[PDB]
Amino acid sequence: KIPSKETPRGVAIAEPIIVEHSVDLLMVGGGMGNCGAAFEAVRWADKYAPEAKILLVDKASLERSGAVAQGLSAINTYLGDNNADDYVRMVRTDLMGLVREDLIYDLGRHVDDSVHLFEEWGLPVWIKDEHGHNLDGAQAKAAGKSLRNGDKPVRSGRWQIMINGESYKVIVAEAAKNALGQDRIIERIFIVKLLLDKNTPNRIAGAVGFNLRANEVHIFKANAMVVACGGAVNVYRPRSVGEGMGRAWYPVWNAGSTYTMCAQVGAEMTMMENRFVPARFKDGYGPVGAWFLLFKAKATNCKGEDYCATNRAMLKPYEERGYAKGHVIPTCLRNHMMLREMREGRGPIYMDTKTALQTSFATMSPAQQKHLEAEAWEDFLDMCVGQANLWAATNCAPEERGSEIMPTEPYLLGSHSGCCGIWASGPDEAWVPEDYKVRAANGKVYNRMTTVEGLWTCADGVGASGHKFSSGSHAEGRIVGKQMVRWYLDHKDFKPEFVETAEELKTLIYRPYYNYEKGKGASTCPVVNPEYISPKNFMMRLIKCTDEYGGGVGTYYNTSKALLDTGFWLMEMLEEDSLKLAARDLHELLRCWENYHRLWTVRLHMQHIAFREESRYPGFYYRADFLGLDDSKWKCFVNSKYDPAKKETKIFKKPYYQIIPD
């Protein structure tokens, strides 16, 4: 009855074992990024470094881990007939002008090759038949048509292609597995720290983590590594605060690890001020696109009018400066026109699918009607099942009643329609500026390497180069995978060493366990206890602070220097309080470290928006005290570098080089 007697329900938690690993190439994460990295690295190692120990570690199991967990309905990056210059041009417009164009171009001339590999591996890809009618992957194979055979995909926009990608991730994880084998892949192990070398300055040396199935602290020594662990979600308070805390657009388990693990160790960060707030179906966040273009269903306010047309004037200052001109509005400016309809109470923003369906069903045959309905529903069943559940629940089959649109709480990501992350290195060509190249102590420049020597990142990891999506994420991993094998061979005789001992690392990882053990006697209830703090409560206290002072949903994405300052004041009592986190079981120890990653990132994101004295992303967030954009003082990137020894962050401007014209 008394709560402290009740069983913890997680795995166990007890004094950990400590198991070390000496490895040549480490890979932290197993999403789209590292599954590309592993695939590439093995091939180069099998020829040039077959004795080299390669290891991939993942929080979950590789088969389903990451954003592509329930699969996708589209691949959003595929040139094929398109040139990588208009690719850079489009990503620049969408992300408000300030992007690393060399990284985007470099990502362009590699990306299609991954998509071509995917099909070959078993991914069902949609292809136009001959009379311009859609064929699904299974029947495209049956017909004998493929991307390998250059047959032009279905495509719902210059850059995207349609797929039956429910098993997308498992197909990719399979290729990474068969290249590595269940001997270079250890799953169900969460990495928390990242250690850098005791000897040479600014050089990476290792990583610490823990097993989620048994009490073990893992210490990894390494020569070169990728940290690609996705973006940051649940850093801001969501629109559903009960059980709906799990229904976010981007995967709820993205704890902002990639961002903090590297920033914490001295890597130069970039564009952390950038966020992404998508406009999706209310509460379930399912994709809208298909319903709009397959049936011509539009967004209407309480008056039934098109708010895009009504609020055109809002775009004047931007199009005159060349940011939006002629019905090619950036995604952020699209939901900037949405917000005024909301804050002035002319909601709800409504997709009338009822009347839009009954009109389009008149100009289609009964069998042609089943086909366009089955395409549209697949956008949920292949991409976002939670939404289909909501429609099942609310009696909202599109035939009989429409649905609501709502902009989501901010998400921090670099691979999708955002660009916050880590300052990476350009390829080293004539067309790449010198400031865009890192180049190590040995003088050579390795592609996509951080300013920390020997550390790589990709896909959500690298900032200022958004719109990679599931294909670019893989392609970037491939780029890195090679550079790591290349790095190892140039630094073959390294031997890494840490300033901290294995015991010191172990007592750090399990601190929240000791916190709980030493303080549990104080209370009859394990949660309400003055000695420590629950990870679920830490989670809540943070997302509240961020919502109210960092420009979350509650404040209509609005912030200022004053609001941020109050934020920071609470933020660093929370930083202090994190030292007194508590774990009853292994699952709680996981949350304890994830929420600590969640703090460091969301704080850094705010420190960046505090610095940039303009509102570069209107509709995503506003600086109330600096409402408009300013190309005079702020046409550039905003970078930061954390000092480990001095526990100080230095936020500075970093010049932007225009490469692709227009």
Partner: protein, 166 residues
Amino acid sequence: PTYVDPSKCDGCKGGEKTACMYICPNDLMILDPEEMKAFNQEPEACWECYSCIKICPQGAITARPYADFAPMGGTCIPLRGSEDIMWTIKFRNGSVKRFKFPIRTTPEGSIKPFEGKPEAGDLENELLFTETALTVPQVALGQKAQIADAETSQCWFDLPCEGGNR
């Protein structure tokens, strides 16, 4: 969020992987070893990705749509085969819609990542092992942005305030 049907769940007696517990990307599925029944240990952290619902051999796991905004009665049930997936959507009012989609063209566990493909080439160029040539920007510029920095446009000299030698 997801829950387990106790009458269907056997706790995975053979092949000592607990399918649900193994697969969950968010570490939410966990087995009670004595009872040989599983559950979701933290339902409010469920992304409702169906990973565990698909992998369950007994089919014991169903999804109750988020209680704090989704009304009762509605449910989605997959049946993921070797090369295809069948969905059945049961509505609150009793309606039923069914679907069938392709998931994979090739057999499970068959990908030979390197078989047939070129061997590793030059460690010093930007070519991946499967590539032979790469595009170079149509027209490439090196135009630095340059930022004014100075907090004033003010000038108190008579002469432009440009060649600021001191």
